[PDB]
């Protein structure tokens, strides 16, 4: 680089631009951390709700296994097929796409409409609620991880 | 000598002239002519010529020229952020300004001195090009508020109509301008 | 979606209408997870928390190219009825994301 | 060359008390007179302001205006990256204050404003900020001059 | 010191009618002859080219090549900051154009080319970009010459 | 000229001066006077002046002064944490030193010369204020060891005696210092 | 003076010399001798000496030298990428190039001038080291496509045979070369 007065003025201008850009990036990082410190507590509340759902579903499953017997449980498992329809629609967070989970939960996927196996049906309901609890937990966790990686990049 | 603007002849000339058209080597390298540095150029005769422009070109011509200058200043301000984080990190209200500035630089300011038609440009042709660009900018700003994506606004066919208005002959421009102004409305009435 | 856990809950997970598989050891669950990742599976795979707390840490050799399925540790049978400290798990999560390990 | 390290601006700073700096950005944005308040400074202002020679709310109003403009100019640059919705409420209040200030207080054109007119306009601009945000102003002046509308100078800017 | 602002090159450029400037970056990559197109110039170029002298599409092809190479160089500067994976689909075409231009148009070795061969290679390179980007070429020339693939020559 | 410390006059002066008090307007912004940079400043007379201090002011002046310098130094190292995480989300052992650093800055490293009992500060007065600050910090740390909410530490009324020890008269000081030294032993043992 | 290569004596010498061996302070500070900057150096006698090499060492010597120069250029190109994303984020095909470039730098270019054996190196010894390094690189490139991890390759004991090769005397080098080539061809066959 040839030393001229014009070059010196241009380099001093570039130095001023860099000094402004550093502070601008620091402000962006502060905003990202402000979002992150609320997203983390949302994730914590979702996690404890999922824990409660798991506890009640396991209790109902134990009651269905003990009293109704493995025969009725196996028959219900045979009669209920798995679910194939899921949605992975993309959500935008700070220019980065993330998958947003949505399970269809359709009608007709559960059989044996009679209420005689009372212990099995309640376990089915509990696991049905467990499904959406797990979906909520995953939907919060993916955003939390992406915000963490964005903060990493800006730092 | 060597393009150094701190030359005593250049500095002595600065204090006694009315207009200053500074040229840039970076624009000349990429064959962008007339290669006038917009940031380092000025003119002191602008305010004294406004009545002539009002009585000889159009009544609203100074407002159009000042809007163009404000657009160029806005584009110049944002380039110190794109250099930092890249053009894809901005919002759509800034990408639109960037694209409008690029359109203005590559259509209005550029001029070929060896072309048959583009070598000479009258005042009314420049006024028409400025009016078309400002109308497009207003429509594109309106379309963003409806949630239309920016990446398809620039794909509209009227951008090529704007970008080739330079080469239209002086005797054909009064019809080309009207059909382009109608095409702006006809394209922006319903995008998607 | 797919769920892997102890075999004592696969029938209960199927009772919800979801795909459920059973596993009993660390390497068996890891191999089952690899088989589920390798196939064109769905957008979520659930893993047992008590056995594999960090499922992505070993499968990122395949999941960095394509990240459509989302992994998640779910609490096991033996630890659900006594509870687990979600506070410590979130402290470790903040440590993995931020690194300061200072939070209240 | 817009260089403050040139000998002619450098030696004048040592002898004179303060300076007034014109900005090319405000000139290219259509604002006349293009006086930039942030790099401007008067070193003998504190001996001329105050009661008995002008109104007693001069210094605190000037300081609060300077601080609010300094906040607003940086918020305006952060907006273009993070967006307006990601802001808080006071950030948008400062964002409105900055451009209202530039449009009304500075861009006066060929007007001749007395000190009372300028103080009234300055108090009108500060009224868009909430109470309690004005830390540099005593409460006696706030109880007397706060809360006036901006639509007076709006009649002919 | 490869200084263009030295007094001898400055005065020589002020007196003569253009220059052919060699680039050390192209020389370090094994490209011969290492002629840098952007800082080069020819003032009397417009007198000798055009219809009835070489071909009617000479000047527009030259201008479009210059603009496209400048865009490719700018995108090369950008990817040193944001990484090539973060590019849009448009800028990757310019990046590949710059690489292929340096590897094929300039790197010709010791062979002798006629003007028709060079124009054919240039039109093969310009066909990599989309047809809507050629703002500096008349649509008649695009209709007449666009569409050839480089694999017919250097495949 | 520009605040740069590499200017030849400053370089020549720094080679021979025994003390170097560096100022900045950043503390003048916060109305913190005198605006002395406690990080960039230094003195080379500290070692030789200690026997005079211990024979004429207090036998434990240098050790206490070094302890307060260390407490000021510990505050500066946490600025890499408060710059990313907020100033309230810290643990007790860090929030306590941040609070005591703020108290030290706003009641010991700040001064006004327009007040009669503060313009001229005797060495015994400064020694007493330093003793009160260190005793408050030590008892707060001991109470934190016993387990207590840190908001109670930032609320206890004894904390204000440190602020109001500046304005006691110079010949009225020792009774005030003894009164504070006996008050501080009372609140922190029962309510914590 | 001060490592400035724009000084008149340096620039007046580059116009007449046929080779330019540029030394670097960064390599000399890290005890990497002879500390020759292989990016700023050049030689104009390379083309004229090829017929001598084609009959006095081996008939494939220029191809081997050009291949190693290309490997060095590729590593220097990747060095910009690795410095901002870390060595882990690169794929196996790039990590292999990084490790091979490091092996070339620390085992072929470096030369101790005070060691008993390493102070003098013949042409055939350097040719054998070049052949061994490129054979290892080709085997590793072949084995990468079979899903073998970089960790499994970098832990191979044959890597230490390359590193210690320059300390073997001239009278014992051909047997070491044969054994090392057989070990290189065998160890990757034993690898998956």
Q: Do A54 and C15 touch (CB under 8 A)?
A: no
Beta strands E18-19; E41-42: pairing state: antiparallel
Rounded (10°) angle between helices F123-146 and F61-77: 60
CA A41 to chain centre: 13
Contacts of D86 in chain A (CB under 8 A): 31
Q: Is the dihedral of CA G159, G163, G164, G165 positive or negative?
A: positive
Query: How does DSSP classify residue B85?
Result: H
Residues in chain B: 192
Residue labelled with tokens 């070193």: D43
D–F interface: beta-carbon pairs under 8 A: 3
Q: Do C100 and F94 touch (CB under 8 A)?
A: no
Collapsed DSSP state (helix, strand, coil) of residue G44: coil
Q: Do D80 and B85 touch (CB under 8 A)?
A: no
Question: What is the DSSP annotation of G123-168?
Answer: HHHHHHHHHHHHHHHHHHHHHHTTT--HHHHHT-THHHHHHTGGGS
CB-based contact (8 Å) between C96 and chain A? yes
The tokens of F132 are what?
A: 């009160």
Collapsed DSSP state (helix, strand, coil) of residue A4: coil
Is residue E94 within 8 A of residue E116, CB to CB? The reply is no
CB-based contact (8 Å) between F2 and chain A? no
Annotate A98-127 with b (16+ C-beta within 10 A) or e (fewer).
Answer: bbbbebeeeeebbeeeeeebebbbbbbbbb
Rounded (10°) angle between helices A69-79 and A118-154: 60
C 57-76 near A (Cβ less than 8 A): 68, 70, 72, 74-75
Contacts of A31 in chain D (CB under 8 A): 78, 82, 86
Neighbouring C-alpha atoms within 13 Å toward the C-beta of D144: 9
CA dist list (Å): G166 to G66, G109, G129: 21, 10, 8
d(CA C34, CA C84): 27
CA A35 to chain centre: 16
d(CA C4, CA C25): 12
d(CA A26, CA A32): 10
CB-based contact (8 Å) between E103 and chain G? no
Q: Is the dihedral of CA A105, A108, A112, A113 positive or negative?
A: positive
d(CA E78, CA E84): 9
d(CA A105, CA A80): 13
Helix (H) or strand (E) holding C80: helix C77-80
d(CA A39, CA E142): 55
The tokens of F68 are what?
A: 């307060």
The tokens of G24 are what?
A: 């670097």
Q: Among E1, E28, E83, whose Cβ lies nearest the Cβ of G11?
A: E1
CA dist list (Å): D24 to B37, B183, D74, D80, E13: 15, 38, 18, 21, 34
Q: Determine phi and psi for F90, rounding to 5 degrees.
A: -95, 165
Measured torsion, CA atoms of residues B67, B70, B72, B78, in degrees rounded to the nearest 10: -140
Chain F residues within 8 A (CB-CB) of chain D?
A: 1-2
For residue C28, give every residue at least 6 positions away whose Cβ sits within 8 Å of its Cβ, in sequence order, or none.
none
Contacts of F91 in chain C (CB under 8 A): 102, 104
CB-based contact (8 Å) between C104 and chain A? no
Q: Do E28 and G39 touch (CB under 8 A)?
A: yes
Is residue A46 within 8 A of residue A137, CB to CB? The reply is yes
Is residue G101 within 8 A of residue G72, CB to CB? The reply is yes
A 85-114 near D (Cβ less than 8 A): none
d(CA F62, CA F72): 15
Query: How does DSSP classify residue E54?
Result: T
d(CA E29, CA G26): 24
CB-based contact (8 Å) between D5 and chain F? yes
The tokens of B142 are what?
A: 């309106």
The tokens of B151 are what?
A: 């990446």
Q: Do G80 and E29 touch (CB under 8 A)?
A: no
For residue E72, give every residue at least 6 positions away whose Cβ sits within 8 Å of its Cβ, in sequence order, or none.
E94, E95, E97, E98, E101
CB-based contact (8 Å) between A2 and chain E? yes
C–F interface: beta-carbon pairs under 8 A: 14
Is residue G102 within 8 A of residue G32, CB to CB? The reply is no
Region of residue D134 (left: phi > 0; alpha: psi -120 to 50; beta: else): beta
d(CA B116, CA B128): 20
**Burial classification of residue E4, based on how many CB atoms lie within 10 Å of its CB (0-12 exposed, 13-18 middle, 19 or more buried):** middle
Q: Where are the alpha helices (DSSP H) in A64-117?
A: 69-79
d(CA G90, CA G72): 18
CA dist list (Å): D128 to B164, D3, D123, F128, G157: 48, 37, 9, 48, 75
Q: Do F84 and A37 touch (CB under 8 A)?
A: no
A 80-99 near C (Cβ less than 8 A): 80-84, 86, 88, 99
Is residue D109 within 8 A of residue D32, CB to CB? The reply is yes
The tokens of B33 are what?
A: 């002519």
Q: Which pairs from E125-133 meet CB under 8 Å and 24+ separation?
A: E125/E65, E125/E97, E125/E100, E125/E101, E125/E150, E126/E61, E126/E64, E126/E65, E126/E68, E128/E93, E128/E96, E128/E97, E128/E100, E129/E68, E129/E93, E129/E94, E129/E97, E130/E93, E132/B160, E133/E68
**Burial classification of residue E21, based on how many CB atoms lie within 10 Å of its CB (0-12 exposed, 13-18 middle, 19 or more buried):** middle
């Amino acid at each position: 680089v040839s030393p001229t007065r014009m070059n010196l003025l241009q380099r001093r201008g570039q130095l001023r631009l860099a000094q402004k850009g550093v502070d601008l990036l620091k402000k962006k990082r502060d905003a990202l951390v402000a979002e992150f410190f609320g997203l983390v507590r949302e994730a914590m509340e979702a996690r404890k709700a999922l824990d409660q759902a798991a506890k009640e579903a396991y209790a109902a499953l134990l009651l269905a296994q003990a009293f109704d017997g493995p025969e009725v449980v196996a028959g219900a498992a045979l009669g209920v097929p798995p679910l194939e329809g899921v949605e992975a629609e993309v959500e935008n967070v700070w220019g980065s796409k993330v998958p947003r989970l949505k399970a269809t939960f359709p009608d007709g996927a559960l059989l044996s409409p009679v209420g005689t196996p009372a212990y099995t049906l309640e376990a089915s309901r509990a696991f049905r609620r467990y499904a959406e609890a797990l979906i909520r937990v995953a939907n919060t966790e993916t955003r939390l991880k992406k915000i963490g990686e964005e903060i990493k990049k800006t730092t | 000598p060597g393009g150094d603007m701190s030359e005593p002849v250049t500095q002595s000339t600065l204090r006694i002239v009315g207009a200053f058209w500074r040229l840039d080597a970076s624009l000349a390298f990429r064959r962008h002519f007339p290669a006038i540095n917009w940031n380092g150029s000025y003119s002191l005769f602008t305010s004294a010529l406004d009545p002539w422009y009002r009585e000889n070109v159009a009544e609203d011509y100074p407002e159009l020229r000042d809007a163009i200058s404000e657009l160029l200043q806005r584009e110049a301000g944002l380039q110190e952020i794109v250099q930092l984080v890249g053009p894809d990190a901005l919002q759509d209200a800034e990408r639109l300004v960037i694209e409008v500035g690029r359109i203005i630089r590559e259509d209005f300011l550029q001029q070929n001195a060896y072309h048959e038609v583009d070598a000479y440009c009258s005042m009314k042709k420049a006024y028409g090009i400025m009016k078309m660009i400002l109308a497009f900018y207003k429509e594109a700003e309106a379309a963003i508020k409806r949630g239309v994506s920016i990446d398809e606004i620039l794909q509209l066919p009227v951008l090529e109509r704007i970008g080739r208005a330079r080469y239209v002959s002086e005797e054909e421009f009064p019809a080309y301008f009207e059909e382009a102004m109608k095409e702006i409305q006809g394209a922006f009435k319903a995008l998607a | 979606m797919a769920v892997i856990a102890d075999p004592e809950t696969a029938q209960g997970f199927r009772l919800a209408g979801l795909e459920g598989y059973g596993a009993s050891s660390a390497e068996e669950a890891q191999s089952l997870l690899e088989t589920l990742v390798e196939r064109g599976g769905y957008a979520l795979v659930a893993v047992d928390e008590a056995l594999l707390p960090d499922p992505e840490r070993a499968v990122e050799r395949l999941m960095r190219g394509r990240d459509l399925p989302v992994l998640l540790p779910i609490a096991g049978l033996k630890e659900a009825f006594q509870g687990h400290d979600v506070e410590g798990y979130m402290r470790e999560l903040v440590r993995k994301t931020i690194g300061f390990d200072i939070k209240l | 060359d817009d260089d403050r390290t040139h000998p002619i601006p450098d030696l004048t700073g040592y002898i004179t008390e303060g300076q007034i700096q014109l900005s090319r950005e405000l000139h290219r944005k259509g604002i006349y007179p293009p006086i930039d308040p942030l790099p401007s400074l008067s070193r003998l202002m504190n001996n001329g302001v105050g009661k008995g020679k002008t109104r007693e709310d001069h210094k605190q109003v000037s300081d609060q205006l300077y601080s609010a403009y300094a906040n607003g100019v940086d918020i305006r640059k952060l907006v273009a990256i993070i967006g307006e919705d990601a802001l808080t409420e006071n950030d948008r209040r400062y964002l409105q204050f900055a451009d209202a200030f530039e449009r009304f207080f500075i861009n006066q054109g060929q007007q001749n404003r007395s000190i009372e007119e300028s103080l009234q306009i300055a108090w009108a601009l500060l009224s868009m900020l909430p109470q309690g945000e004005l830390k540099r102003i005593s409460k006696d002046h706030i109880g007397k001059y706060y809360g006036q509308k901006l639509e007076e100078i709006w009649g002919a800017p």
